[PDB]
Amino acid sequence: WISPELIEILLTILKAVVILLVVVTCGAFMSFGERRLLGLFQNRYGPNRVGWGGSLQLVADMIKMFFKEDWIPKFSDRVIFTLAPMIAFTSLLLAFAIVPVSPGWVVADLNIGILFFLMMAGLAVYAVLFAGWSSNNKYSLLGAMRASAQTLSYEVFLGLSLMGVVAQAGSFNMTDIVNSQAHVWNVIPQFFGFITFAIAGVAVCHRHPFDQPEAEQELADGYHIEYSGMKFGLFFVGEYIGIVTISALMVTLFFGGWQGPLLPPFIWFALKTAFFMMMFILIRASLPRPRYDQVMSFGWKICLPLTLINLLVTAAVILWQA
Amino acid sequence: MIPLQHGLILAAILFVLGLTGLVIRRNLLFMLIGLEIMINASALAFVVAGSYWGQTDGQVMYILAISLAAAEASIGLALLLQLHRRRQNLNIDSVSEMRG
Amino acid sequence: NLRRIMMPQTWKGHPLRKDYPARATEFSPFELTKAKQDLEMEALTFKPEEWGMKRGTENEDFMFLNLGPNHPSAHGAFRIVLQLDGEEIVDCVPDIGYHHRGAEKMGERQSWHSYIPYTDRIEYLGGCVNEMPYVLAVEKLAGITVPDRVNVIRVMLSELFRINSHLLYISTFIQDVGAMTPVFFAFTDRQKIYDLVEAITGFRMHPAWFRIGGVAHDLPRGWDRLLREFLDWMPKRLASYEKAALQNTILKGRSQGVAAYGAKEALEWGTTGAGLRATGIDFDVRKARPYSGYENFD
Amino acid sequence: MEFAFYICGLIAILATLRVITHTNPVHALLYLIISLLAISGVFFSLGAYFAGALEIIVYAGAIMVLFVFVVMMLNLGGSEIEQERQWLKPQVWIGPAILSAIMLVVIVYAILGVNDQGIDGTPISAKAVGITLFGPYVLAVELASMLLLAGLVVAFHVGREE
Amino acid sequence: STEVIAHHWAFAIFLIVAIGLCCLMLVGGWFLGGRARARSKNVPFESGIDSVGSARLRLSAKFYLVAMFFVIFDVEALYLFAWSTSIRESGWVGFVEAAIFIFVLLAGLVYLVRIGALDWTPARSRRERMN
Amino acid sequence: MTITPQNLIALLPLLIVGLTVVVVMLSIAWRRNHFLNATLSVIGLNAALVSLWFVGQAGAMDVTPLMRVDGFAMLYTGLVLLASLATCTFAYPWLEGYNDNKDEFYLLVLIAALGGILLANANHLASLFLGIELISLPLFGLVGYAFRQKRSLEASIKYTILSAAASSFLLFGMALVYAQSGDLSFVALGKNLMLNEPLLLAGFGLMIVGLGFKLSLVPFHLWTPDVYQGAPAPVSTFLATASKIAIFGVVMRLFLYAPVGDSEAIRVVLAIIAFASIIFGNLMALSQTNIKRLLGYSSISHLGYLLVALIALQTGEMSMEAVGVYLAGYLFSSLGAFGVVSLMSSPYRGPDADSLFSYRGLFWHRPILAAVMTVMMLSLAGIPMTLGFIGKFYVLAVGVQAHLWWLVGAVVVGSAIGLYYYLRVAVSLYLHAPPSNWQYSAGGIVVLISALLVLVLGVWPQPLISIVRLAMPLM
């Protein structure tokens, strides 16, 4: 089995496996990082005792989550109940599989690209829907209805917010998208696409301020009330992986991806992705939660016309300069 | 090297399955689901035909097909809402008082 | 609907009667059995027919939801039973009595002096504010006119605990609206107040420090240093809370126009304090019926 | 390519057969999701990448609306399952079974006589579909916008409360 | 070629290992640790008191009209997705077509907003009474 | 190919109807005004009707692969525009009694008229599919416009489900045809053939299933009396005239242009469908006490007569002008009959007046409406001095020229059965039974003008013959 083609195949497979393991590790260590960064933003420390600087807090949480009683309620639809954390873990991981983290480091150089991300987000809503319905809990059903309402709010304009970047690159492929930002990052021309994608991508992960399915103050944590043990941990690890994926996609589409003047390309990609991960934490710490009817009104009356007008203006600019 | 006949046969199987579901189900929601299966099978047949000829027209007809499917599902859900509001049941045999 | 409101439905007797025994040790110790647990859990279960509520319309069913006693937004042992049409509240029944401590019955059970710590725990974020009307009413019974220094000490402790309670209230409102950060800083401000309050009274939450005829001790040497430190610390923190949270338009959209009532509704329900004065009725006890030397402050 | 086509088609056939003969509506919606994912995999195996992407994209939203309506009306525990199971009898399905079978037999007999050189599966890009869509098919785009407008107006007029 | 089939294998292994890791963590959570036994353990959580009814009910959502409209608007979005990847090839004539399409879309949206089709807030939650 | 300014000039009624759809909808968004929105809709339809003159001055040419504009498209666009204008005129006094919102009716009528114009100009399988759905879906809304009633909701659900099924059938047939041929244009359906390829024939059979549903042709006809009775009476007017006329026009164009129109198997299947349609539609209307169901079975029979004229399209040369003359006469007679039904049901008060006991003795309170309705019953019967006879005479001449003797005998037998039930209605008008607004008067003027046109062109048909012979497509 000594051939350049085969060893290139295993090299690509090994690079994909490394990307997958690093993304899952970043989700778990960013549960820990959310705790530490919230401590930083709130003039405190967060977990800094278990290990050096709290570095073993994630290990202790993982051991506790594994040896917790992982139960399935007798009143629940058992197969759907077990299936919902699997969807929550896998959907935005698969969405990460199109992110080019470096030249030569991408799992899937798909022709559809950002279309595959839209596919995975549209699949990702069903995790919360199935968790809310199957658990046979009133608060969880209210959370599932709120999650569907949220999906109505953002999915109408998420892809349209990406369409200006798609129009400028002339392609759905994400490597072409980062190559079209060789001179100017897309946050400058596609600024309105950037803010609408920021809103819709925060709403994709059901992160605060769009945590209405899991609203603690209203629904007492909502759709995942009956979950415990590693199914609950699956929901939150999938949420943090979704934060990682949305931040990396924001970097890839609007901030040049890995392109930068001095540092190695992965250093630039990791720095920008870490900045937007921190921004996820900071907006969780900073701003209050709107009512979900107000969120639906904002998505349908403000964001969607903004994305349509942005696409029209972007096309007029492109055809004027061609 | 997929034969065109195999794709057409798969689309025909899905079409007749959706038609059977439309006939044998009294619930209006399952009838709408069978209608969705029918139109999706016809759109799959168009995609197969477009891929055999190497033409974009198969996917263009697919796009028009799912636009019709979306608007038809919208109208069917509105009518199902009216049937549930005005009958408290989704039995399609109950709405049969015009005859002869 | 003349049913019990403090005691469970399967309660025998009327506890504020003079022949009803006060102490729990008069009766058998609490023995939770399976039959008793099933009985009192049946008695706690909401019955919508007893409150004139239907189970739904013809088109849809109403969801009867327990908002409490264990809910993050219920401020204690407190249940509201929500009749929900989707997310709309058709009607609600607030179910109280889960925090009944028999404090009035205990008032008949303790001496005039030994009852003061119970007055502290009537409104447990209030402290010396709760002590003040009791000691003033006892001093009316005793024919006592306290000196001016007592009046100023009691006013200062009352205003410190009013700031403590208001800090908790504002931060928890912001937390309930959705922004969780200002509660950390506001409890730091509460710790500055508690530095002064611990130094003066020896205790944080329930000082039990007012006395019939005065206060328990003189002010310790160096209290003014702690008061000056808190008065320097507070206003920048409060301005930061205002700008960061209370002037955020999402918080305004969550709160402005929400659960609104006017002067007539405030008067007919006995609403006092900030709700009544929010209706425009300028009624504060410290101005209308001045007590404890509050007339000497501007 | 043929591996993906045959396995995705088999999964789509089995999931659709599970859909039309199922009692629980939420389970039926999940099998419908699985069947549409499988048909999208069939689309990807034939080189119709845009059609497969749009198949997952717009049916994930559409079945979400179906779930909303199922939660609004159908889900009641075992009451709707018992009512739906009593609606299905051996006679009720065996009636249209031969009708669908002979329709499939006639359609398959007509299919098997056509000239077939095979589908090579060369990808037809989304850019080419966009060029054709806004090229020769301009009137299709504008009148499809009018069709979706009509769907909007009909849905608003019918599906209201008062 | 070879990079394409290498990326196909990488995508396959990525999906397989991700699903297998999820299943492995589910199995490890299921089998490790003890189990609790209680009389009311298998009762759904509703803040410590028994339910009135259950979660299996005809709970009427208020945004169902917006759900129909969302399905329609997602199909319009895919038409614009097809346009946006080939803007330079379609030229100004394709721009005029998409401008007409987007204008009809926006007129339908304006019509839906103005007739109150997108409003489902109850009257006591519309926040009319402010200072 | 692109869109030339000349192509835009040929696109004028489509552009005007789409623009007035947008304008009427924006006016609805601004403020609900029943009078203003009805006026804007009829102004747009009249503007398209008078822009037909500029379309005629342009000439006959192709607009994209999807559309072809010739005199045939002009004639059928004019027919569907007249049907839509009459539907709006009948709809206003009916909608005056409607408590809910009335302005969406005209929006749905305009979008359905747009679908009719597209079917008039359709040269493509994509155009045919899109025109069919652009007609059908606004009719899902219009048939169930009074969804607060049992019958309108029943008719809406039946029409919606069955038309979705027919659209799926038609789309699968189109896909099979495309898989055989490789082109979706009408002229290329059978160019690569030996014309009886099994997949092409099966595709055209499934398209025949969908199109025969839309044309109420046996055995895809069972929806017709239910949906005609359940729907509001102006909706029944539109569904009987514009949908049938536009779909039969695009079917004529498809069978004229496609090389598989000359296949013998398709001709035999269509002959069987036409025979069964004529006989069954006439037989089922014999014992109908409801005027709407009777007119539905009547529509089945009349579409059977038109199908007879379509079967002889490849053989003779008179078939297309026969279809034009027949469709003009049938449009005017159906407008008169369904308009008298609408004006008797106006204003809306719940259940419409559709029983024959309601129309029994109509002459003693509404003499003009009784005269119009009896003229329409004579015309639908194919009695001389009416335009319906001129259409029946054209159908018989076309059938005799092609030696379709079974269809000729079917037309004679069905005409006798029709004589029975039409004369029953017409004489029940004159037995003995046991408004005040200018829009109602406009509806009365419309049915009176239709009656006078039916009488005059039955006596003197030559102007209609010359007009229809002028409306010739591209060979």
Ligand SMILES: CCCCCCCCCCCCCCCCCC(=O)OC[C@H](COP(=O)(O)OCCN)OC(=O)CCCCCCCCCCCCCCCCC
């Ligand atoms: C990599 C991904 C992560 C990236 C991280 C960084 C970006 C994070 C983005 C966070 C987005 C939060 C968006 C929140 C939208 C809330 C809109 C809403 O519903 O507001 C409601 C409120 C009052 O509602 P109203 O309609 O007036 O009242 C009707 C009452 N029935 O209405 C109002 O208060 C009106 C004003 C609404 C303002 C909307 C928010 C503006 C945009 C987000 C904040 C800025 C983020 C940074 C942007 C780039 C800056 C360079």
Ligand SMILES: CCCCCCCCCCCCCCCCCC(=O)OC[C@H](COP(=O)(O)OCCN)OC(=O)CCCCCCCCCCCCCCCCC
């Ligand atoms: C209150 C406001 C009221 C507003 C008015 C409403 C009522 C009146 C409506 C007026 C409509 C006018 C339509 C005019 C169509 C014909 C225009 C024309 O000039 O056609 C001529 C053209 C052939 O001549 P030429 O132009 O020289 O062509 C050479 C090569 N192109 O001819 C052709 O190519 C074919 C032309 C014939 C096509 C059919 C005619 C149009 C549709 C008529 C439908 C109704 C017919 C049945 C009723 C007949 C009654 C007598």
Ligand SMILES: CCCCCCCCCCC1=C(C)C(=O)C(OC)=C(OC)C1=O
């Ligand atoms: C490999 C498996 C590792 C499992 C580790 C799970 C750790 C979950 C912590 C997430 C979290 C939860 C649940 C949480 O409730 C919370 O409070 C709002 C946080 O912030 C302080 C969190 O970070």
Ligand SMILES: CCCCCCCCCCC1=C(C)C(=O)C(OC)=C(OC)C1=O
């Ligand atoms: C979680 C990070 C620190 C914030 C601490 C929570 C804020 C203060 C708690 C308010 C509160 C009070 C007083 C309270 O009494 C109560 O009932 C038990 C609650 O519901 C659970 C409350 O939320």
Ligand SMILES: CCCCCCCCCCCCCCCCCCCC
């Ligand atoms: C917070 C950043 C999260 C990144 C997640 C994705 C990273 C996947 C693993 C990438 C490993 C290889 C990096 C590139 C190697 C070549 C360059 C080396 C010098 C920087």
Ligand SMILES: CCCCCCCCCCCCCCCCCCCC
């Ligand atoms: C209460 C009303 C229920 C209506 C159910 C209708 C079911 C119809 C099933 C028809 C099955 C036909 C099977 C084939 C028959 C032979 C071929 C067609 C006739 C020649």
